[PDB]
UniProtKB/Swiss-Prot annotation:
Processing after translation: Contains a chromophore consisting of modified amino acid residues. Maturation of the chromophore requires nothing other than molecular oxygen.
Biological processes per GO annotation: bioluminescence; generation of precursor metabolites and energy
Gene behind the chain: GFP
Expression across tissues: Photocytes.
Applied uses, from the record: Green fluorescent protein has been engineered to produce a vast number of variously colored mutants, fusion proteins, and biosensors. Further generation of mutants led to more stable proteins (at 37 degrees Celsius for example) with brighter fluorescence and longer fluorescence lifetimes.
Outcome of mutating V62L: In EYFP; leads to yellow fluorescence, folds faster and more efficiently at 37 degrees Celsius and has superior solubility and brightness
Impact noted for substituting Y139C: In mut1.9; shifts fluorescence lifetime from 3.03 to 2.74 ns
Quaternary organization: Monomer.
Annotated consequence of substituting I122V: In EBFP2.0; shifts the excitation and emission spectra to shorter wavelengths and increases quantum yields compared to BFP
Reported effect, I165V: In EBFP1.2; shifts the excitation and emission spectra to shorter wavelengths and increases quantum yields compared to BFP
Protein name: Green fluorescent protein
Result, substituting Q63H: In P4; leads to no detectable fluorescence. In mut2.2; shifts fluorescence lifetime from 3.03 to 1.94 ns. In mut3.3; shifts fluorescence lifetime from 3.03 to 1.88 ns
Amino acid sequence: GEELFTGVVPILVELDGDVNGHKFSVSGEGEGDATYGKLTLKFICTTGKLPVPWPTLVTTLVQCFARYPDHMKQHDFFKSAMPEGYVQERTIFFKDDGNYKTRAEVKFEGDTLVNRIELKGIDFKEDGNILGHKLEYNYISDNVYITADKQKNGIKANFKIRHNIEDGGVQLADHYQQNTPIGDGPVLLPDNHYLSTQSKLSKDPNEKRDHMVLLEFVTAAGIT
């Protein structure tokens, strides 16, 4: 499975979302180079204006592109599930606001790594930081804490994203994650570790559609 990642791999992302009844879709394209933990992606809202902030979608919109140090390669669940892929599910609780629930299938379609996602958001405040578009657009950086889930032959993870708000404050997004293989072959069930992830958000100055450019680095850590 890891052999599929030694070079540059094209990526396609497709998301359908509904947040407090606001429906939208996002498409993305780019490439990943797991040797360097490196992702370059561009996302477009294909239905018009995105009804939530782009930064709140970053985590939802391919952790198989993590750089695992040589000494940790036996702990890389994500690549070990390929090419058949895995189901990635989250609940994302926005403190003092609504939540997202997401279900994605991440797998190869030929030579392209595809992430197909459905997102449902409920209980948001119409004037909160999310539906009110009060978040900064710049960077997200944090650590994804992974543990084995022997019962689903997969993994769980938990992490926090501390989104900066335009007034100087913070909007916390508490993430709970589960991944389960699609296929029936052996997978690597890891010791506890984390992915150190840095996402840089930008705009394509020639792009008139509502969009997000992402440069991301993802590195496994936490084992000696």
